[PDB]
Design a protein around this ligand. Structure first.
Ligand SMILES: *[C@@]12=NC3=[C]C([C])=C([C])[C]=C3N([C][C]([O])[C]([O])[C]([O])[C]OP([O])([O])=O)C1=NC(=O)[N]C2=O
Length: 107
């Protein structure tokens, strides 16, 4: 059970440009509120800043990354998000998109 998104790395703040139906269903947000925005809107009071830093650095480096983050649905309730970001590069080495697999691991 997992969800999938695509961020556009050609734009400076990596906006999400595509989300799977499960990502909407899992987070409670619609596309009108998801597309065009950075994924960090799912973060909140309990989100570990040291893990948010690992993703920021990997993205700045064009590296893959796997972190576990506390996220919040639209209704404010928390859930544990096992998130894996993969860079996609053009043949000239530039990163074009980041792709994310997100798993709710609250169990
Ligand atoms: C989010 N999923 C997600 C998926 C992709 C493909 C990318 C590139 C990022 C995310 N994020 C995080 C966010 O966009 C950002 O990378 C980090 O917060 C670090 O940068 P900042 O500026 O905030 O320090 C995801 N973040 C979430 O909280 N939940 C996800 O599902």
């Amino acid at each position: 059970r997992h969800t999938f998104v695509v961020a556009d790395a050609t734009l400076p703040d990596c906006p999400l440009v595509y989300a799977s139906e499960g990502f909407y269903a899992m987070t409670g947000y619609g596309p009108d509120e998801v597309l065009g925005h950075n994924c960090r809107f799912l973060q909140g009071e309990g989100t570990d800043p040291k893990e948010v830093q690992k993703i920021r650095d990997a993205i700045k480096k064009g590296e893959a990354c796997s972190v576990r983050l506390l996220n919040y649905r639209k209704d404010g309730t928390p859930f544990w998000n096992l998130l894996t970001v993969t860079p996609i590069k053009t043949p000239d080495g530039r990163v074009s998109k980041f792709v994310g697999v997100q798993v709710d691991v609250t169990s």
